[PDB]
Amino acid sequence: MSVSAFNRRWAAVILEALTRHGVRHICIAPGSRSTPLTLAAAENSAFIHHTHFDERGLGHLALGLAKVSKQPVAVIVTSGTAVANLYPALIEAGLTGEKLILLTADRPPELIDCGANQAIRQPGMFASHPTHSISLPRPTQDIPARWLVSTIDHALGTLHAGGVHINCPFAEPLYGEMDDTGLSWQQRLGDWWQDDKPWLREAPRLESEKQRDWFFWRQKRGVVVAGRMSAEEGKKVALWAQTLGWPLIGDVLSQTGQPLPCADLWLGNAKATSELQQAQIVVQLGSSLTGKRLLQWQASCEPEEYWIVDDIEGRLDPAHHRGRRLIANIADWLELHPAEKRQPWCVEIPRLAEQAMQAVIARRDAFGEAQLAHRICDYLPEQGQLFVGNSLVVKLIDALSQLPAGYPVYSNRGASGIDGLLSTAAGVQRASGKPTLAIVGDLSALYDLNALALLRQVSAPLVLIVVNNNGGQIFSLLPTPQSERERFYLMPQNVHFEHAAAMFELKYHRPQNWQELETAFADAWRTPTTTVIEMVVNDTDGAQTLQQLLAQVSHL
Amino acid sequence: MSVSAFNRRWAAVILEALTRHGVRHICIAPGSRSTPLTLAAAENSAFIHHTHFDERGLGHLALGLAKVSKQPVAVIVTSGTAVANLYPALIEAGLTGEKLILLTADRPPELIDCGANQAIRQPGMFASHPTHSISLPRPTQDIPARWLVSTIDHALGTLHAGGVHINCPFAEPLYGEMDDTGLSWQQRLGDWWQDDKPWLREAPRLESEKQRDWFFWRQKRGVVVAGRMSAEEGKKVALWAQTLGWPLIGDVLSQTGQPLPCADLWLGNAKATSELQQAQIVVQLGSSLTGKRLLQWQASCEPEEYWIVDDIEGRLDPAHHRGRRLIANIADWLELHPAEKRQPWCVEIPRLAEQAMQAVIARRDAFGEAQLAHRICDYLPEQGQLFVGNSLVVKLIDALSQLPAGYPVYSNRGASGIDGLLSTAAGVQRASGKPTLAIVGDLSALYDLNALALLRQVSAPLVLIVVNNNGGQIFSLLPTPQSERERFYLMPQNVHFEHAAAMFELKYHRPQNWQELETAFADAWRTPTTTVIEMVVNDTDGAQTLQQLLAQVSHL
Amino acid sequence: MSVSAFNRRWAAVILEALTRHGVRHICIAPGSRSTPLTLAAAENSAFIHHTHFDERGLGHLALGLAKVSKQPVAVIVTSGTAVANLYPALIEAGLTGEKLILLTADRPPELIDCGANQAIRQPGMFASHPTHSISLPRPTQDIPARWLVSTIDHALGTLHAGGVHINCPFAEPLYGEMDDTGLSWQQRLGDWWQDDKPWLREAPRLESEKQRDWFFWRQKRGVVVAGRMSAEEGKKVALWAQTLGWPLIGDVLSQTGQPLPCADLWLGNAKATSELQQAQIVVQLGSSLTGKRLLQWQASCEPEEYWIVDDIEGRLDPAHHRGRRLIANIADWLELHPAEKRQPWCVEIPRLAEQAMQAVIARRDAFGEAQLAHRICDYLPEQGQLFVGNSLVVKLIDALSQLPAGYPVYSNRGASGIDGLLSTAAGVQRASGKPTLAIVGDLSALYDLNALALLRQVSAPLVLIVVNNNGGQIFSLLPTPQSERERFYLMPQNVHFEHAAAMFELKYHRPQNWQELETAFADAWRTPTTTVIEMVVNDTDGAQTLQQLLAQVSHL
């Protein structure tokens, strides 16, 4: 009876079970207690293995992989704070739906709360942020393998969205010669080992029914709001709203083509909000709305009914409107509630939106971050994808740019953390294999700086733009008090990123003008490597430029 | 009734209450939801403020400050994944006793579970790892200020060791002019505002009683095991064990002067374990024993009684011996249980230890990490302190070096995470103002790389030795299969650290021999700045040198 | 490898371990899954076994035993809702400190969440209400017996107060021939089996330090408030306050002799409140103060310092005064802070207390519940003890009677549940062997009615007075709205208790006047049995009488 061998048979059942639920990517950090899990995964030919030394970055790498692939993505870490570092990505997945399967090695129960090295209390340490939590018992042949495979199958099969924490205690010895221990225990499962389905198939679907009064509401004065959704969903929603004749307020994350662009500006104009008061229903598809003026308009508007369609569960309207919360695949939902051609009812807002875009176009020349956002369309890689960071970049693009319909945009806009953007971008790139443009701020790039290691391996060109305004300049846009703004809010670090690029052998450009930025991009798309482009700009120009465009358009 | 003003009065009560329990250092990360806490702290003259952009590093900075200063240390972060990043340091503090007071700003309850940006479930998110958890209510004048201060005073007053999670929801508006809203609410507390004491004094002491049969047991054949303790405590334990005539097995963390050095080697010798079988009692002071051979001997020994004296609560013997678990300040415990002069009963172990050290000296010449550990006394700054990283460095120093009695050693040997070593060393340096030698591995340095930002501000010279053996070479010691060793265990990243140091404008050396290392040190001690010394060594030389020395000493 | 036998050896280690921490009484409910625990308990001769069929009642029986004996009391229930029924007594123990050890049998992990009969999720099902929770692992010889005993030893050894939940999963077969499986596993513990000590002695004492400025504060104008404490402690507190010349406000639970009786009445008089605002310090010993006027005076008074001395931990002043919380054995605390002989400073309150008592005595004649309460001192059994139920009985006794110093009083005044009073009283009687007077209301008697089964076995006479005012007439005392008062507050059940008594073969009396009541008492004290005395009174006479006395005394 080799405990080491049986540990690995147990682990093998876990990993093999995960392959029956679409787990292809597995992100592994180093350790010894994780040996049963890590070796079982290394020997399993279904997996693509990714490795990293920072478990926080590892969780975000998995998050980007799951985010793009729409499949569950596995993680293996050893016991201790390695497990805790998964918390940020797990929380994000809890908000936006990524299926992260966290296999967290643990000490056996006899070694907890007795002063053993690298042993902590792991069951339940993520509280309610996992969708499902499994604390596996101490491995033993007296618990049949069909129990273990059934537990995994229940968790993955019923997983609508979010993370799964599977705590995996293993007792030492962890190494030794692998004999027959556990083989007949495994072979109890018979030809399941040669099958391609779960041992237990439990996959109920969670979805809202057709709205039987839709033929009434689609003829009222409605507004369509498009939040985060897939690229194809964005094109379908644009066509649907156009057909209804309802104005479409389209978020940077919507990939609708934003037919009424610069909503963050023109929603600040009284003629627009006055026109939107006529709306009798608001139908929102997707969530995590980006722009400040849009969140204020949502909070203040009073349609008779407010609907939010999304495949995420729970309430998504932070203003708590009377109305409906409809759980569905958006494309399914649109087919279930088709539009019928009706003439448009807005007259003032299309003109305001065009005038707003003209007001931004008037200011495109300065080599600043607002202008980079406004012009970002010109740098999108063909057949590529955009990963947009948090703080000012996503806000400025949403307010100032009109992104093409169906061009994929990815982001971390659940909790909007600045702590994993580089490694998330790495996973986003690796999952699809597409050329990738990623744009982040300086503090964000410092936060996830060691994920540049991961960016040394990309399967297609990845451009990382670091906007360096020397601090978190979103807080210059906020009414912070001037006496404490720098030390306690902006926190300028006074760095550049050429030495960072050189450390990880990444190409680097610090362009001084539009010509040099173009040159840097043209060089960058030529090889499957990461190029770091640092755009150094004056601290508060971007925030000021947005405030000024905001005032101007409000006076139209 | 300005929400903004009252928010700031509420927060002001929280921070001022913390000043009555010795909180002096406060570590602050940037954010908007945290504005009430951050501004209250910025206005309160009792605090020393430290700032950082990475909240994981922020937590470890607080941990090092608290570890050295023995004072409770406060942290302020904004809502979201920023809170989750505190989990590693919080867990470590729960193991080794540092008092971290985490003021975690939160959205108000009406903005939880409704799709609100940067809003997550924060109460209870640290599960059972905080010593105390306080989920403060939504601020309101209808709850009296004496409840708020009384709750904080209860948490801080009863805090024997570990972290306190104080979750602080605040509703917007967060900014505005300070009017008199909440002023009379504050003035309910009277002249407590001019006092220097808690509003409620609740400070019961948790301490074990004097052992009435101690005069019986001190006459038996005992062994003293000295784990992590204060420097003064290490010296007192040395004198105490010497007077009793009992052998002292002294950990690298013990600061006892290790009179039987290289215990990790001679404990592998059957004559040593045979002599130690004669011991009728083992009295261990401190815990988190470092060495493998020591943990194995502790696991196998069967004294009549095994005692562990420590100010940490709970079980500390991972082998679960029959015996006693005594909660006490170690110096206090020694005074309550004095030694009586007795002739020593060990004869063979002193000789074995002298031979072990001589065998190590025979190998001191190679420019390797085993030799660096062995020779490390030659580089300790006068009246300074040593911060020792995890994995091979602490193990090699413990096995191969004899550190001087009472010279301060610091570490993160609770969970032994490699995720916060640089920011912890920064806090350790700032707490004492002493010149500091910190030594970490390459993967540890990459893990906490951005904490080089913090090392741009030290009050005395800090030498950071980064031992670069290209991966986690502690894992070459385990019998992992060679087929997966590099990719799935060692994870070499193939970097150097010259550009990291240059990025943060820190002096850098890559010495090639002992004299160049001496030159680097002499350069480093001249100014109160951080110097990065990268020691490049071959992958497995250190590990296999330790194995060979173990075989040699074990066959003596 | 008999699973049945090993289950029983694992259980045997658990029970034997408890005998080393003073567990003498064990309360057992019937079941099959609990067989290992139950049979281990039955063959262990250290225990006194009590049985009951209602697990809620069983927990309260354990609570009464622990409440009197001040020793830990063990409980065994089987899996399922039986475990949930322990919650009330566990919560009460969490407030007032009884050490109830809950051994809750469980299904093994492979039978959780799979549709198995009588299997529920039991780990953590009591949330934070146990002082300590242990979720034992699935029994196996691969976890050594020293681990199990050390876990129990940690839990019991550090238990200052409150409950311990020990969840004990067992896999079938539960029955079978008892062979040698697990015998050498037990024997690893050596002669620990013949010992009388814990395997691990871990017993730190939690106690507040001596107040170094006590000689300053005892010379000021103080008030002594005496809450729940032991009978001895009540006598010592009376002597101490008398020595200081400080007024003593003595609760019904204090056993101080209440030298200023009827505080619930004279505290309503403004001359008392005005004189009491001269007080510079209030020293309260014990907690769970009974009377409304006393709670109101505590809420409004503002001494310079407010101290609460008690052996219960945590805050105990629901008004959150500036002052001190001091954790100590109350008698020890008085010896550490002795009184000094000083002239009394109150003049008006003694006159008021005397006049108030006179006002109550003027109304002693009517055959009502207020008069029974007022006259209860004249009926206490010699060398006996009083168990006072919740709602009006304890309020009226506290307001209207003067109980003798040092005469034992017991109650459930933590959460003041009306759900376990009869079974608690049974435990109170069985623990001390003393003749017992227990007084409850009609709804309270219905709540725990089947606990009449337990009252068939008492070791000395127990009188159970059931005051039948046809509903919860405390809700006639509150300003409830009259239109809904009967159906939704009073809830009269219109029963008597003659047939209940008859069902359990208990002697029964329904006295119609004082003479018949005294005859009933005289009959009852002659034999070691339970006699039920039902006192039928008109619904609102007690509540109104108390209101009238309050108004009258308030105008003196």
Ligand SMILES: Cc1ncc(C[n+]2c([C@@H](O)CCC(=O)O)sc(CCOP(=O)(O)OP(=O)(O)O)c2C)c(N)n1
């Ligand atoms: C892990 C964590 N911790 C702290 C924060 C708080 N937080 C922000 C949110 O408030 C902004 C959410 C949003 O975009 O809506 S923004 C921000 C500064 C960003 O600095 P930058 O990269 O230089 O970019 P710039 O501001 O354009 O100059 C911080 C520090 C966080 N989000 N996540």
Ligand SMILES: Cc1ncc(C[n+]2c([C@@H](O)CCC(=O)O)sc(CCOP(=O)(O)OP(=O)(O)O)c2C)c(N)n1
């Ligand atoms: C946050 C987290 N995540 C993962 C781990 C697992 N873990 C280790 C545990 O074995 C440490 C037990 C010990 O320190 O004795 S060591 C180690 C590699 C260290 O690489 P290095 O700095 O180059 O040093 P070297 O090995 O001497 O070459 C890892 C990755 C962890 N501890 N903490």
Ligand SMILES: Cc1ncc(C[n+]2c([C@@H](O)CCC(=O)O)sc(CCOP(=O)(O)OP(=O)(O)O)c2C)c(N)n1
């Ligand atoms: C398990 C549970 N559930 C409900 C309650 C609420 N509760 C009470 C407490 O609130 C009284 C607070 C106190 O005593 O300080 S009293 C009470 C009615 C009692 O009726 P009775 O026995 O006929 O006695 P009488 O009112 O004097 O005639 C109820 C129903 C509870 N305490 N516990």
Ligand SMILES: [Mg+2]
């Ligand atoms: Mg910035």
Ligand SMILES: [Mg+2]
């Ligand atoms: Mg290394």
Ligand SMILES: [Mg+2]
């Ligand atoms: Mg009643």
